[PDB]
Design an enzyme around this catalytic site. Structure first.
Site, short mmCIF file in Angstrom:
data_model
loop_
_atom_site.label_atom_id
_atom_site.label_comp_id
_atom_site.label_asym_id
_atom_site.label_seq_id
_atom_site.Cartn_x
_atom_site.Cartn_y
_atom_site.Cartn_z
N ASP A 166 0.79 -1.23 0.00
CA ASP A 166 0.00 0.00 0.00
C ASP A 166 0.84 1.30 0.00
O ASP A 166 0.53 2.25 0.74
CB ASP A 166 -1.07 -0.03 1.12
CG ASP A 166 -2.15 1.04 0.94
OD1 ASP A 166 -2.44 1.42 -0.22
OD2 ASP A 166 -2.64 1.57 1.96
N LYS A 179 2.14 4.87 -0.81
CA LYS A 179 1.49 6.14 -1.16
C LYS A 179 2.25 7.27 -0.50
O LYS A 179 2.98 7.02 0.45
CB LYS A 179 -0.01 6.17 -0.81
CG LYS A 179 -0.35 5.91 0.64
CD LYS A 179 -1.84 5.56 0.75
CE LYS A 179 -2.15 5.03 2.12
NZ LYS A 179 -3.44 4.31 2.13
N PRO A 180 2.16 8.52 -1.05
CA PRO A 180 2.92 9.63 -0.47
C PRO A 180 2.74 9.83 1.03
O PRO A 180 3.70 10.22 1.68
CB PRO A 180 2.43 10.84 -1.27
CG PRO A 180 2.11 10.23 -2.67
CD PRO A 180 1.41 8.95 -2.25
#
Ligand code: 7YG
EC number: 2.7.11.22
Length: 277
Positions: free
Chosen positions: A118, A120-121
């Site tokens: 997962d 993400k930024p």
């Protein structure tokens, strides 16, 4: 928990709320994640205490009293840094340093058969020294779909370390262009956004794709776009690396280890970010 004084909320992650906290005994400033407990989870989470690397957020302690994860405190996340850098863009040398370090963290995790799943930024954390670290590594084994590999979206139940390469390729493109590469707001919209840019996958580019659980022969057939249109400010080395991180077939997608040897990193350096804390 009586040992921790909560300072402020610093995020609402996938499997729990994250707080900046102070250890009342040591004075240590930490990130406290309250997990939203099975024996399998306790054992799996305990193995993460041993997965130590300079590009992985250190998991200091696991408190089972329901479940709390005590992590080292980083000062900012990449989402906040990208937003703060939106007028000028993150300088290319810093993008390359961040990508190189994240590939190092992924090469480490993947060599230990641990997937993130997962990226993400919001789960990429930075410090004033120029470091970037992966947060929430191994927790998986409104939801953002933007960084989801196509094999997850197509129903592959036993996906590989290639999913993390896909997510990191999406983040790399986003740092370069200052726009999310595939900002889908549903699983189908996410899939069709990928297809519109990279071409609808077929048996030629992805053997076995047409037999995937969620593949439909009725999917529209879109042509692939050139990377010169996808990521313009990115030089040819960056574009070839990105194209290899976004290969449809997970078996053809570049590994983190092979990506580290790519010509794009020949002139890698470690610049200092300008952080407003
Ligand atoms: C929510 N916004 C408005 C405030 C916080 N934003 S920030 O960029 O200043 C920031 C973000 C994250 C962290 C931080 C520090 N150390 C950590 N170790 C973590 C962390 O583990 N985060 C995390 C994120 C997602 C899921 N699980 C954990 N976060 C610190 C500042």
């Amino acid at each position: 928990m009586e040992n921790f004084q909560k300072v402020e909320k610093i995020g609402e992650g996938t499997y729990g709320v994250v707080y900046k906290a102070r250890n009342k005994l040591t004075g240590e400033v930490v990130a406290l994640k309250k997990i939203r407990v099975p024996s399998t989870a306790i054992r799996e989470i305990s193995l993460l205490k041993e997965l130590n690397h300079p590009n992985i957020v250190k998991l200091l302690d696991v408190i089972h009293t329901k479940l709390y994860l005590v992590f080292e405190f980083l000062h900012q996340d990449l989402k906040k840094f990208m937003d703060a850098s939106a007028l000028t863009g993150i300088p290319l040398p810093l993008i390359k340093s961040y990508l190189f370090q994240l590939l190092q963290g992924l090469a480490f995790c993947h060599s230990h058969r641990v997937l993130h799943r997962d990226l993400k930024p919001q789960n990429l954390l930075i410090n004033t020294e120029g470091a970037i670290k992966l947060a929430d590594f191994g927790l998986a084994r409104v939801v953002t779909l933007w960084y989801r590999a196509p094999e997850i979206l197509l129903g592959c139940k036993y996906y590989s370390t290639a999913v993390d390469i896909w997510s990191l390729g999406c983040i790399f493109a986003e740092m370069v262009t200052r726009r999310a590469l595939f900002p889908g707001d549903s699983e189908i919209d996410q899939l069709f956004r990928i297809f519109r840019t990279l071409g609808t996958p077929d048996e030629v580019v992805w053997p076995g794709v047409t037999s995937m659980p969620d593949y439909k022969p009725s999917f529209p057939k879109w042509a692939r776009q050139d990377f010169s249109k996808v990521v313009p400010p990115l030089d040819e080395d960056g574009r070839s690396l990105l194209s290899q991180m976004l290969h449809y077939d997970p078996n053809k997608r570049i590994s983190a280890k092979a990506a580290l040897a790519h010509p794009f990193f020949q002139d890698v350096t470690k610049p200092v970010p300008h952080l407003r804390l």
